[PDB]
Amino acid sequence: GLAAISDALAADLAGLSFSSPVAHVYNPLLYAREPHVAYLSRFGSPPKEVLFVGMNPGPWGMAQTGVPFGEVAVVTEWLGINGTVTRPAGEHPKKRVDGFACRRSEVSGRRLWGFIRERFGTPERFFARFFVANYCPLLFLTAEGGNITPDKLRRGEQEPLFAACDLALRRTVVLLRPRVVIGVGAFAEARCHEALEGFDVEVGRIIHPSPASANRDWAGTALRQLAELGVDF
Numbered sequence: 001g002l003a004a005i006s007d008a009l010a011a012d013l014a015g016l017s018f019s020s021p022v023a024h025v026y027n028p029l030l031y032a033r034e035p036h037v038a039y040l041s042r043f044g045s046p047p048k049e050v051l052f053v054g055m056n057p058g059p060w061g062m063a064q065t066g067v068p069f070g071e072v073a074v075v076t077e078w079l080g081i082n083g084t085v086t087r088p089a090g091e092h093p094k095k096r097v098d099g100f101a102c103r104r105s106e107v108s109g110r111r112l113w114g115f116i117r118e119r120f121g122t123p124e125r126f127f128a129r130f131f132v133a134n135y136c137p138l139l140f141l142t143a144e145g146g147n148i149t150p151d152k153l154r155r156g157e158q159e160p161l162f163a164a165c166d167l168a169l170r171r172t173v174v175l176l177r178p179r180v181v182i183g184v185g186a187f188a189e190a191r192c193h194e195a196l197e198g199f200d201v202e203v204g205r206i207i208h209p210s211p212a213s214a215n216r217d218w219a220g221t222a223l224r225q226l227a228e229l230g231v232d233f
Helices: 002-014 033-043 072-077 107-120 123-127 155-176 186-195 218-228
Strands: 024-026 050-054 130-134 139-141 180-184 202-206
Touching: 002 033, 002 155, 050 155, 050 186, 072 107, 107 123, 107 218, 123 130, 130 155, 155 186, 180 186, 186 202, 202 218
Parallel strands: 050 130, 050 180, 180 202
Antiparallel strands: 024 139
């Protein structure tokens, strides 16, 4: 199942190495494995019509909950997922892992899942046709605790990472058999196009929900973009 794919990915990432400016690496697939597997098992049953793909976790989302775009509030309240989360070895004090006790809200996840809930009401109606997964489960931090996107990695270190993640995504698409794969943001979409070349699947994009990315009407834009891709939302 999905759990096997995630475990395989984590194992593949276990051997990886990253150089300066990278100083801290979080792998929520390890320290937040139980809620992650809960998500996969409860909401990831094949087949899916559409797959949403995020690039990498935010510090207050999946890095805390193990759930893609997993803002604590919406994960506990709507997905009904709680669970034990331990701390990563290379934890930075400016981005501490409090798990479901974390009091900061990940805006991207709050917005995305808030939107999904707005459209579908219950998780069952959404996951009947859709799923959301994370391309790269690793969080990268500077010595000062600043975020580093996978984009800004050394090519020699970036290539195997993207290799493992491409593998994971391919296995994911094979299992869930979606007709459309939608990257959340440009980076995710690029990764989807490259990783899934050769697949009989349409690769698309919706605007990234981050305020830091970004017009005044993200939800309307994404709804429109979904309309263009021929997916009823």
